Structure 1
Amino acid sequence: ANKTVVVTTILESPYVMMKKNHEMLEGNERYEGYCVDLAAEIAKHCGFKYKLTIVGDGKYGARDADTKIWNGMVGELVYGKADIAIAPLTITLVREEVIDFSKPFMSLGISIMIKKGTPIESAEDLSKQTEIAYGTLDSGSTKEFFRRSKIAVFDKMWTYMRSAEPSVFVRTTAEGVARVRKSKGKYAYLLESTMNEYIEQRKPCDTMKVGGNLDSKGYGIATPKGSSLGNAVNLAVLKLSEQGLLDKLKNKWWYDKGECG
Structure 2
Amino acid sequence: KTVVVTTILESPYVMMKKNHEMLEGNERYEGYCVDLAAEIAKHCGFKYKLTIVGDGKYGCRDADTKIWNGMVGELVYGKADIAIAPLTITLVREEVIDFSKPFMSLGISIMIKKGTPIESAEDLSKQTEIAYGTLDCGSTKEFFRRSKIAVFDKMWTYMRSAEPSVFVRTTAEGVARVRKSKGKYAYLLESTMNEYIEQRKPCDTMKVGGNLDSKGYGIATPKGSSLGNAVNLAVLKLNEQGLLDKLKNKWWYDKGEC
TM-score (norm 1): 0.98
- Residue of structure 1 equivalent to 2:222: 224
- Give the drift of 1:66: 1.0
Residue 165 of structure 1 and its aligned partner are, at CA, apart by 0.2
| Runs of 5+ consecutive residues of structure 1 not aligned to the other structure | none
CA distance in 2, matches of 1:148, 1:45: 38
Cα distance per residue 1:206-261 (max 9 Å; x no partner)? 0000000000011000000010111000100011000000000000000011100x
Deviation, structure 1 residue 169: 0.3
Alpha-carbon distance between aligned partners in 2 of 1:174 and 1:257, rounded to the nearest angstrom: 18
SS in 2 for 1:43: helix
Aligned CA RMSD, in angstroms, stands at 0.5
Aligned ranges 1:125-136 → 2 under 5 Å: 125-136=123-134
Tell me whether 105-114 or 151-160 shows the greater mean CA deviation: 151-160
| Distance in 1, Cα, partners of 2:191 & 2:52 | 23
CA shift digits 1:21-62 (9 cap, x unpaired): 111111100000000000000000011110000000000000
Aligned with 2:225: secondary structure? Answer: coil
| Partner deviation per Cα, 1:144-169 (whole Å, 9 max, x = no partner) | 00111122221111100010000000
Q: Hey, what's the Cα distance between the residues in 2 that align with 1:151 and 1:64?
A: 25
Identical columns (%): 99
- Secondary structure at the counterpart of residue 253 of structure 2: helix
Distance 1:154 1:129 in 2: 14
Q: Deviations over 1:158-214 (max 9, x none)?
A: 100010000000000000000000000000000000100000000000000000000
CA drift at 1:67: 1.1
Q: Distance in 2 between matches of 1:209 and 1:64?
A: 32
Specify the SS of the correspondent of 1:155.
helix
CA distance, structure 2, for counterparts of residue 99 and residue 184 of structure 1: 41
**CA deviations over 1:82-119 (Å, ceiling 9, x no partner):** 00000000000010110000000011100000000000
Moved over 6 A (4+): none
Unaligned runs of 5+ residues in structure 2 are: none
1: CA distance, partners of 2:32 / 2:153:
34
Q: Which residue of 2 aligns with 1:66?
A: 64
Q: Measure, in 2, the Cα distance between the counterparts of 1:98 and 1:146.
A: 22
Aligned residue for 2:239? 241
d(CA) in 1 for partners of 2:65 and 2:254?
45
CA offsets per residue over residues 116-142 of structure 1, 9 Å max, x none? Answer: 000000000000011000000010100
* SS in structure 1 of the partner of residue 161 of structure 2: coil
Match of 2:253 in 1: 255
**Distance (Å, rounded) in 1 between the aligned partners of 2:81 and 2:176:** 33
Give the TM-score normalised by structure 2: 0.99
**SS of alignment partner, residue 162 of structure 1:** helix
Aligned length: 258
Distance in 1 (CA, whole Å) between partners of 2:151 and 2:116 is 21
> What is the distance in 2 between the residues matched to 1:110 and 1:174?
16
Instruction: Give secondary structure in 2 for the equivalent of 1:190.
Output: strand
